[PDB]
Scaffold this active site. Sequence first.
Site, PDB file in Angstrom:
ATOM      1  N   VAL A  61      10.906  -7.893  47.310  1.00  0.00           N
ATOM      2  CA  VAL A  61      12.039  -7.978  48.271  1.00  0.00           C
ATOM      3  C   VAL A  61      13.249  -7.222  47.712  1.00  0.00           C
ATOM      4  O   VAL A  61      13.406  -7.184  46.482  1.00  0.00           O
ATOM      5  CB  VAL A  61      12.346  -9.459  48.557  1.00  0.00           C
ATOM      6  CG1 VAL A  61      13.576  -9.621  49.439  1.00  0.00           C
ATOM      7  CG2 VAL A  61      11.154 -10.213  49.126  1.00  0.00           C
ATOM      8  N   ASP A 102      20.218   3.312  56.176  1.00  0.00           N
ATOM      9  CA  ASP A 102      19.281   4.422  56.240  1.00  0.00           C
ATOM     10  C   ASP A 102      19.464   5.268  57.517  1.00  0.00           C
ATOM     11  O   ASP A 102      20.017   4.837  58.535  1.00  0.00           O
ATOM     12  CB  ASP A 102      17.852   3.933  56.081  1.00  0.00           C
ATOM     13  CG  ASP A 102      17.326   3.166  57.280  1.00  0.00           C
ATOM     14  OD1 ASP A 102      17.142   3.777  58.329  1.00  0.00           O
ATOM     15  OD2 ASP A 102      17.140   1.948  57.163  1.00  0.00           O
ATOM     16  N   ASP A 157       6.916  10.967  50.925  1.00  0.00           N
ATOM     17  CA  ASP A 157       7.208   9.961  51.934  1.00  0.00           C
ATOM     18  C   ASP A 157       8.630  10.135  52.463  1.00  0.00           C
ATOM     19  O   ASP A 157       9.373   9.168  52.642  1.00  0.00           O
ATOM     20  CB  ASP A 157       6.961   8.549  51.428  1.00  0.00           C
ATOM     21  CG  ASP A 157       6.654   7.534  52.523  1.00  0.00           C
ATOM     22  OD1 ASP A 157       6.168   7.997  53.621  1.00  0.00           O
ATOM     23  OD2 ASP A 157       6.925   6.302  52.270  1.00  0.00           O
ATOM     24  N   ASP A 164      13.365   5.681  47.846  1.00  0.00           N
ATOM     25  CA  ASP A 164      12.001   5.148  47.775  1.00  0.00           C
ATOM     26  C   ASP A 164      11.009   6.157  47.194  1.00  0.00           C
ATOM     27  O   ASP A 164      10.216   6.749  47.936  1.00  0.00           O
ATOM     28  CB  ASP A 164      11.514   4.557  49.090  1.00  0.00           C
ATOM     29  CG  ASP A 164      10.325   3.623  48.931  1.00  0.00           C
ATOM     30  OD1 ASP A 164       9.705   3.608  47.831  1.00  0.00           O
ATOM     31  OD2 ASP A 164      10.048   2.887  49.902  1.00  0.00           O
TER      32      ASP A 164
END
EC number: 2.7.11.22
Lengths: 296, 262
Positions: free
Chosen positions: A19, A88, A129, A147
């Site tokens: 998380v 984002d 990604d 990420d």
Amino acid sequence: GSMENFQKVEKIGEGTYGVVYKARNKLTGEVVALKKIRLDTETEGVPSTAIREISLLKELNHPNIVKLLDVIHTENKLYLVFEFLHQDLKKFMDASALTGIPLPLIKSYLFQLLQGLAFCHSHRVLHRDLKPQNLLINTEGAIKLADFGLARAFGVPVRTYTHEVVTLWYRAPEILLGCKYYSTAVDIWSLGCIFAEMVTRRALFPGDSEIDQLFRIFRTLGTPDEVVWPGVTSMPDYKPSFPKWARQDFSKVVPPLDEDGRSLLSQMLHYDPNKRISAKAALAHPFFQDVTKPVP
Amino acid sequence: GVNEVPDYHEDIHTYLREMEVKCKPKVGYMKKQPDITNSMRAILVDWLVEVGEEYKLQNETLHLAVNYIDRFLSSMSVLRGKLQLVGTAAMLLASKFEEIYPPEVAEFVYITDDTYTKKQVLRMEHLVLKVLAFDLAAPTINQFLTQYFLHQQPANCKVESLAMFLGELSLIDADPYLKYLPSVIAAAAFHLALYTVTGQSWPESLVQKTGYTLETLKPCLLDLHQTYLRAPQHAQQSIREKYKNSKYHGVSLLNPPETLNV
Ligand SMILES: NS(=O)(=O)c1ccc(I)cc1
Ligand SMILES: NS(=O)(=O)c1ccc(I)cc1
């Protein structure tokens, strides 16, 4: 470090590896994101995905890549401390759904994404990604690659890396057609798909399967051939039945976009991996000769 | 070809050169290890070779593991009965970093003949991560070798294999090889493999890439030539066996040249 100086503020997200919380350093005031990665201490140990992310981000110090600030260890948990960014690109485009996203902001963001990406490639790291949900903006007009979960350090020349890579929508056609070797280009493709999406706020190729993903690209860009993309017809997952779609006009595909925009986009979306523009090259492109850094 | 990353091969090379200095182990660490020796390490590295073939692992993985080990032992004293634990854990990490389908932890416990528990392997994994501080993306001999192969005109499979093989021979012997950077060993290995099969020498194009002349590669070339020549008689053979196979064009069965003519 220590998890006693962090005061948890809220859960900003989650994932297969743990998380994500937003946190506040009680002593310095700094606001962070904490990624808690659970350690399989009796079974599989530290996840390969965390090993890659930490190792790689430890090497990528650039203002357009998200900063890993710390890794705090327990016997049982690993906490990643990241710089906190406000949201984002996906969330932003969805909120700019009606107002629209200003062109100079689009150009800024693309320019930054390319600067960030060129650094990765210059440091032998594929991202694999890139997609809006993995790109973080702040309130000051900055955007950053984030990420690095699926990233990979690469060799020159490249070798066969995991094929199951890149969200379908942002997946380059060389992966779809099932080639052995992929490279820096697959990242550029994604940014192309992102560029288009910033402009239209709709996904460019939203396919519901692989064969579907290919059809969506081919209708829009024209079914590739040996004169556009030598080697395409000999590709593993190529099928000679593919309908022969006329290439669509980039002024239908991205109406708002100027002639320079359409040029950069097309070079980003080239079928041939070898002919597709580099991040390094894209930075020179005339679309950016007048770039600025506005705030959202 | 984008698989050779034209717009980055230089930036990447420059970076590997700077990073290989930073991932470099302490050259005289074994002197400061009260209970382990270059021979013990040789046995460990040689065993990792076997493991790499049983699990069909990338050569890059073997190279990364040995990087991990040497840095680990530059910082931590370790007893002989734990040497293998360090080895197993490094191979595990290397695999997780580098392999598409790494073996499971279970498999690594299997190959130490249950010398250790799974739990020891995992706790050593964590310790090795902590010691290295997660700096795992080490430039290897291989990473330089592949970049050097590109200068071949045309490519020759036998040159590639022989240079790979000569690179792995170096892994075994901390003395002398810990004193050479990867890009140096890699060059010496390439020059020496190319000289052997063709008669040609370090390309001038690689001189221009690397800044390494034959003069600068001579010390390393001397050490490595001697390794090549004594190779049949070494205590460790796993690498010779590996490179007998048709996979690697049987370059280990190739007889080494007697002099390198300066
Ligand atoms: N996925 S990640 O760990 O790179 C990350 C996610 C969200 C923020 I805000 C900062 C970092
Ligand atoms: N694993 S660690 O605690 O050595 C570490 C420290 C700092 C960073 I940035 C990443 C990792």
